[PDB]
Amino acid sequence: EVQLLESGGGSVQAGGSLRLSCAASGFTVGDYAIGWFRQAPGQQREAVACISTDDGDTYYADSVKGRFTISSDNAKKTAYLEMNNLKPEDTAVYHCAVDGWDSSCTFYSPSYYRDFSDHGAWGQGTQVTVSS
Amino acid sequence: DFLPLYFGWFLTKKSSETLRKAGQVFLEELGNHKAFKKELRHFDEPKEKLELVSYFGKRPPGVLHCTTKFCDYGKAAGAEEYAQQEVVKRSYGKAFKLSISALFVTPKTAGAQVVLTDQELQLWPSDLDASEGLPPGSRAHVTLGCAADVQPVQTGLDLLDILQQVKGGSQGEAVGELPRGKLYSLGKGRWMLSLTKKMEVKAIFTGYYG
């Protein structure tokens, strides 16, 4: 029963910090990759980050490198995005996305598309809103 | 109209690596295979003799793929009519499992024979402008290596070309046998490893962008 319990976001001000946490359920440990995508209103979704429960390797968009940091308590099967220096241009509805087909971050890459409903899951919404 | 560079099934990192080390181990074994070295003349001086792991050592890096349609972003060759197929849209980004019937090598290229399912064939396009007398999707392949200036969809044309030989029974019987499959030879470097066990790989029918 694949379900992502995402949380930890909300309104903040520029330079602030948030922590999106996504407790994925319905997947084994090591054969899934969990990472958020932020899709601002009226723009295309972009992979903010992911972490492989197998490799333990992480990916980051260039814009969020060093500012955001993903993590995975593989035991608890939850992941956390440590967002920092959040800018108003980071306002979007962040979506936890788990890739059960590929524990890789391969299809979090912006060069492909992965319908996370087939062999994964799509987070409904953890709305981030930076201000000032 | 959010069309890619080209539609296709893109193997996972895992499987793609699995196909690689298997493809390279195939190159190694055939290179040291005696009968192959007997037809080494058909494949200046023997400074390097022949090392197949280095003969097609040039290989586009990343996840391997079996291209359905080449779009080039927007209708290049009826591509936008391909993307308009409800089958293609409904399959975009979904997960699929490709079956590698047999690896192969040729003086030009080296790849793998993908035997698409009926459902996977709904995507495959019969548009392009050796395919004669061969069933649909026979071009379905996965390029594993090309020797330098061999620079087109030549592993698909080679695979199909090698499938024409077999069509007429040119297989040539078991010229020998490598580990994980059987071996055959049908022409100038037209060697083929018929895997005794299908190498089933995991892929996703999405499109490339870049």
Side-chain angles (χ1 to χ4, degrees):
Chain A
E1 293 179 354
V2 297
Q3 157 165 54
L4 310 177
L5 303 177
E6 61 210 304
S7 68
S11 300
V12 298
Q13 190 171 252
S17 51
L18 284 166
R19 194 130 173 184
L20 299 183
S21 296
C22 175
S25 61
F27 321 82
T28 197
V29 191
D31 222 327
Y32 81 98
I34 177 152
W36 285 269
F37 294 64
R38 65 189 182 183
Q39 192 266 276
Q43 294 80 44
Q44 183 150 75
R45 78 187 188 179
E46 65 182 320
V48 208
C50 103
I51 187 170
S52 181
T53 305
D54 209 56
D55 272 70
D57 68 328
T58 61
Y59 145 95
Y60 298 94
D62 325 335
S63 26
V64 303
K65 268 170 206 168
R67 342 198 345 267
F68 302 3
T69 289
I70 188 165
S71 37
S72 169
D73 185 358
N74 313 280
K76 298 295 183 182
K77 200 158 50 164
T78 78
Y80 329 78
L81 185 63
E82 181 88 273
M83 300 195 301
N84 306 96
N85 292 333
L86 278 139
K87 302 297 186 177
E89 59 256 18
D90 302 325
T91 294
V93 180
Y94 291 55
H95 293 141
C96 174
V98 173
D99 194 324
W101 193 247
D102 197 348
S103 83
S104 189
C105 219
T106 280
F107 297 89
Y108 296 72
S109 181
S111 50
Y112 313 99
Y113 167 89
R114 236 292 253 181
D115 182 325
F116 284 90
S117 80
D118 187 288
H119 263 96
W122 192 253
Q124 182 175 1
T126 183
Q127 207 303 315
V128 182
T129 288
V130 169
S131 74
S132 78
Chain B
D1 194 66
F2 183 52
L3 274 67
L5 214 177
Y6 57 100
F7 285 82
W9 299 276
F10 300 81
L11 268 68
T12 46
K13 173 184 172 196
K14 180 179 180 178
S15 77
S16 57
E17 290 155 359
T18 311
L19 177 51
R20 182 179 63 80
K21 296 179 177 181
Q24 295 305 126
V25 96
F26 172 38
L27 288 180
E28 304 151 33
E29 297 155 10
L30 183 63
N32 304 270
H33 180 215
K34 295 180 178 179
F36 184 78
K37 295 177 289 197
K38 182 179 180 180
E39 294 77 69
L40 174 61
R41 301 72 155 172
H42 315 152
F43 195 76
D44 171 62
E45 274 109 37
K47 293 179 179 180
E48 65 124 313
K49 295 179 177 180
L50 177 57
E51 294 177 352
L52 296 175
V53 287
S54 305
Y55 180 76
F56 339 80
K58 179 54 138 66
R59 3 175 163 73
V63 300
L64 287 52
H65 64 90
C66 169
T67 307
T68 55
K69 179 63 172 67
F70 176 85
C71 179
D72 211 326
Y73 319 123
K75 183 179 175 182
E80 191 168 357
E81 185 182 358
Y82 184 93
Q84 248 100 71
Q85 305 179 90
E86 294 175 348
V87 306
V88 172
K89 182 179 179 180
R90 297 295 182 190
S91 289
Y92 204 67
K94 303 298 183 178
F96 305 79
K97 257 177 281 154
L98 312 167
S99 232
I100 293 171
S101 159
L103 303 187
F104 62 82
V105 335
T106 131
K108 297 177 177 179
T109 63
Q113 180 180 15
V114 195
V115 192
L116 277 36
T117 88
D118 290 327
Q119 295 171 325
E120 294 180 343
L121 236 61
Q122 302 195 67
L123 298 319
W124 194 257
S126 184
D127 97 295
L128 290 178
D129 293 0
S131 182
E132 296 176 356
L134 270 164
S138 293
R139 292 71 55 193
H141 81 281
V142 166
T143 306
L144 300 179
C146 288
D149 282 354
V150 45
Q151 303 168 329
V153 178
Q154 186 52 69
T155 316
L157 297 173
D158 268 306
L159 172 61
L160 232 200
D161 164 47
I162 294 169
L163 287 158
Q164 286 291 65
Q165 297 174 307
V166 175
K167 203 88 214 201
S170 156
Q171 287 174 301
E173 296 175 358
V175 180
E177 42 155 34
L178 292 179
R180 209 161 155 187
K182 297 180 177 181
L183 229 63
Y184 302 82
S185 197
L186 301 70
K188 267 223 151 215
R190 316 276 298 289
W191 296 77
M192 164 175 186
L193 163 57
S194 273
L195 300 159
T196 60
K197 184 52 184 166
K198 270 234 167 113
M199 275 202 316
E200 183 226 283
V201 298
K202 282 194 297 201
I204 278 152
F205 184 67
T206 191
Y208 177 88
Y209 299 83

